Amino acid sequence: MGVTCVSQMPVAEGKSVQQTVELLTRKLEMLGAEKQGTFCVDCETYHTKLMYVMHNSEYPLSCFALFENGPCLIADTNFDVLMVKLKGFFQSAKASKIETRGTRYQYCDFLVKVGTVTMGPSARGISVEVEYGPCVVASDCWSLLLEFLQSFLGSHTPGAPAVFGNRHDAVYGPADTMVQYMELFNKIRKQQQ
Amino acid sequence: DHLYVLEHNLHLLIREFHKQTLSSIMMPHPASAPFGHKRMRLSGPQAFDKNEINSLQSSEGLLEKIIKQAKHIFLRSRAAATIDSL
Amino acid sequence: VSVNLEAFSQAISAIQALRSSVSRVFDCLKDGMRNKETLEGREKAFIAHFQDNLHSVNRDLNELERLSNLVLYSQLLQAYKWSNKLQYHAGLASGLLNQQSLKRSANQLVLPPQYVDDVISRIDRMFPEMSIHLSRPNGTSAMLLVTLGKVLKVIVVMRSLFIDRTIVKGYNENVYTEDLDIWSKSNYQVFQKVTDHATTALLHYQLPQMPDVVVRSFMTWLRSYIKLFQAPCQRCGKFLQDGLPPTWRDFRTLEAFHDTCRQ
Amino acid sequence: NTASLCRIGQETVQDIVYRTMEIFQLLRNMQLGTYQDRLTKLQDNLRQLSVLFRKLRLVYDKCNENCGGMDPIPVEQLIPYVESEERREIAEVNKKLKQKNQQLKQIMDQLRNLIWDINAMLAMRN
Numbered sequence A: 001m002g003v004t005c006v007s008q009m010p011v012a013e014g015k016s017v018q019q020t021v022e023l024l025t026r027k028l029e030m031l032g033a034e035k036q037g038t039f040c041v042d043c044e045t046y047h048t049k050l051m052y053v054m055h056n057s058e059y060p061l062s063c064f065a066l067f068e069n070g071p072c073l074i075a076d077t078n079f080d081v082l083m084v085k086l087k088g089f090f091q092s093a094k095a096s097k098i099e100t101r102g103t104r105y106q107y108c109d110f111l112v113k114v115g116t117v118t119m120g121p122s123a124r125g126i127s128v129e130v131e132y133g134p135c136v137v138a139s140d141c142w143s144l145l146l147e148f149l150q151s152f153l154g155s156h157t158p159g160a161p162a163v164f165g166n167r168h169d170a171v172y173g174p175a176d177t178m179v180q181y182m183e184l185f186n187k188i189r190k191q192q193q
Numbered sequence B: 001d002h003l004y005v006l007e008h009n010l011h012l013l014i015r016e017f018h019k020q021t022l023s024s025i026m027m028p029h030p031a032s033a034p035f036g037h038k039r040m041r042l043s044g045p046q047a048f049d050k051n052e053i054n055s056l057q058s059s060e061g062l063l064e065k066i067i068k069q070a071k072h073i074f075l076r077s078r079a080a081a082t083i084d085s086l
Numbered sequence C: 001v002s003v004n005l006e007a008f009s010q011a012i013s014a015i016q017a018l019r020s021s022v023s024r025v026f027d028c029l030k031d032g033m034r035n036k037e038t039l040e041g042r043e044k045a046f047i048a049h050f051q052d053n054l055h056s057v058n059r060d061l062n063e064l065e066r067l068s069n070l071v072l073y074s075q076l077l078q079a080y081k082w083s084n085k086l087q088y089h090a091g092l093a094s095g096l097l098n099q100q101s102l103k104r105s106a107n108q109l110v111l112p113p114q115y116v117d118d119v120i121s122r123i124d125r126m127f128p129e130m131s132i133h134l135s136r137p138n139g140t141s142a143m144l145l146v147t148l149g150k151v152l153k154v155i156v157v158m159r160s161l162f163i164d165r166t167i168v169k170g171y172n173e174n175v176y177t178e179d180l181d182i183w184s185k186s187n188y189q190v191f192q193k194v195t196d197h198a199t200t201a202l203l204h205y206q207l208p209q210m211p212d213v214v215v216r217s218f219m220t221w222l223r224s225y226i227k228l229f230q231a232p233c234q235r236c237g238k239f240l241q242d243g244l245p246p247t248w249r250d251f252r253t254l255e256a257f258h259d260t261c262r263q
Numbered sequence D: 001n002t003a004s005l006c007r008i009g010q011e012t013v014q015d016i017v018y019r020t021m022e023i024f025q026l027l028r029n030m031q032l033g034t035y036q037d038r039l040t041k042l043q044d045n046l047r048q049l050s051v052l053f054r055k056l057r058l059v060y061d062k063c064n065e066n067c068g069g070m071d072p073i074p075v076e077q078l079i080p081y082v083e084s085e086e087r088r089e090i091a092e093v094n095k096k097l098k099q100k101n102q103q104l105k106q107i108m109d110q111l112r113n114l115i116w117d118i119n120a121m122l123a124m125r126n
Helices: A018-030 A076-084 A142-151 A176-193 B004-022 B038-044 B064-085 C002-031 C038-068 C073-098 C115-127 C189-206 C213-223 D001-030 D034-066 D085-124
Strands: A002-009 A034-046 A052-057 A063-067 A072-075 A097-108 A110-119 A127-132 C130-135 C143-148 C151-158 C161-168
Touching: A002 A176, A018 A076, A018 A097, A018 A110, A034 A110, A034 A176, A052 A076, A063 A176, A063 C143, A072 A076, A072 A176, A097 C002, A110 A176, A110 D001, A127 A142, A127 A176, B004 B064, B004 C151, B004 C189, B038 C115, B038 D001, B064 D085, C073 D001, C115 C213, C130 C213, C143 C161, C143 C213, C151 C189, C151 C213, C161 C189, D001 D034
Parallel strands: none
Antiparallel strands: A002 A127, A034 A052, A034 A097, A052 A063, A063 A072, A097 A110, A110 A127, C130 C143, C143 C151, C151 C161
C-alpha cells in the first residue's frame, strides 16, 4: 500500500479526448519516465443501496467490492464468479459500467497513470493517479504528492483527497485507492455535458 | 579440485525441491480450502502487486542457481587475490 | 522555571543599558561639536550622534517595559557553586582537548553476550519511536530488527558489540520475520540509497575503543530518518530529482540532503 | 641508542597530553563506593603523570648532554634537493620474515576458504 492521489484533468480547448492523453503522456515521458507495462481498471455496478466492484490490473488476482461509505471487501477473482452465479438473485443495473485504460509511466519510485474513463464505447474525461510505494505513511506524504503534481500536472492539481480524511497514523490501504476511484467514477458518470 | 561445497548445495537444493511437495506451507493453512501455497493465498487476499510479491513466485532451476553461486565464489576469490597482491 | 531566570538576567542588562545610554546622551552633549574639517560635516556629525544616542535611550526603555510582561549553611551553597563550576570547566576542557588529540599511534575480540543485550536494551529504552528486536539465529553474532515508525525497518548485523552490515527495508515490505532475512534488497531505489548511506554512516561512526557510543550515534542518526518524505533539501526543494528529500543527513548536523545535490 | 631515546621522548610527550585528557574526562564524569574508585583512579593518574614528567625530563637531559661529534651541520643544510655486517643481518631477517609472511598468507588463505565453505553450507542447509 503506497499513498496515491487520483484526479480528473479536463481536455480543454478543442483538444479531442485522445489528443489530450497523447499530449499529457508525452509530457510525462518528458520527465525521464519509462513505461512499465499497461494498466486496466474495469468497474461494474449494482443498484443494491448501490454495490460497486472494481479491479485494477496492477493487482493481478484481487477484485474489490465497495459499498459506498460501507466497508470494502478485497477478495479473490472467484468473487466475480460468485457474483455471476447469484446474478439471477442479484440486481444488475443498466450499462453503468465505467473503465479507465491508459499507459503506466515510472519516474524513480513514483508510478503515474493517465487514463480516459471511457464510458461504455465513448470516452469522456481523464483520471491521473500518482502512487508512492516507499511511502507507507499517508496524510502527510501529501506534501510529496503535491510537489510532484505541480511539477507535471501544473494547473488543475488536486488539493488532496478526503480518503486521507481525519489526521491519523493509520496506514494507507488498497481500499483507499479504490474509494478515490469510486468517487472519480461517480463524477464522470454524472458530470454530463 | 573437487569443491564439496557445490555438491552439498546441489544435494540440499534437490532435497528442498523434494520437500516442496511435502511442504507444510502448501497444506490448507485455514480450513476447507484448496491446499496450495498459503503465502500466495494471503497475497491474493491482501491484494498483492503484479511482480512485487508475485511475478514468478519462485521459478528458477538448479543449474541457474549453481552457476550464480560458482560465479560469486570466483569473484570473491579474484578480489581476495587482487588485494593480497596489492 | 529557567525561562523566568533568563528574562530576569536580560532585564538586569536592560536597566544597565538604559542608565548607560542616558549618561551617554548628556556626556556627549557636554563635549559639544568638534571641528570636522567642514561646516556641513560638523553640523551633520553632531546631529547624527545625538539622534543615535536619543534613539538608544528609547530602545532601551522599550525593552524594559516589554521585559516586564515576560517576567554550616553557606558552605553548602559554596559546594554547589564549585560543583557547577567544575562541571562546566571540565566539560569545556574535555571538549577542547579531545577535539584536538596529539595521539599518533597505539603501539609505544571477546565480549559477554549479556553485556551486549544490556547495551541494546539501554539504547532501546531511549528513542521511544524506535523498537529494536534482539535475536541470535546464527551464533553469538546478534541481528537487530529496528522498526522506525511506519517508515523504516532496518536490519543491523552485529558480529560483536560492533556494527557490520545494515540493510534498511520498507515497513510494508517483508523481513520474512523468521529464519531473519539477512541477505536481500528493498526493491525500492530510495531504500537502497538509504542502505548505502547507512553503510556510509557505519564507516563514519567508528570509535576505536569504546563500542557503545558508536551504536548510540548510529541509532541517533537512524532516528533522523523519521522525517523522511517530509523535509526539505536546505539547498534543494522537496524532490530534487525524484529521490526523496534526504537520502542524506549530515553527520554532526541532522539535516536532510539529496545525494545528487551534495553530501 | 640516542635515536631510540629520542623516540621514547616523543612517545612520552605524545602520551602526557592523552593522560591530561583522561584526567579531564574523569573530573567531568565526577558528579558529586564509586567515589573511592574515582579518587584512587585520579591519584594513580596523577602519580603516573608525575612519573612521565620525570621520564621526559631525564630523556631530555640525556639527548641534550649527548650531542655526538657528528652534528656540525645546522638544520636546512641537510635536506637533499635536486640540484656492512648490519646490512647482512638486515637481509637475513628480511628473508626470514618474507618466508614467514608467505606461510602466514597461506594459512590465512586456508582459513578464509574454510570459513567461506562453512558459511555457504550452513546458509544452504536452510
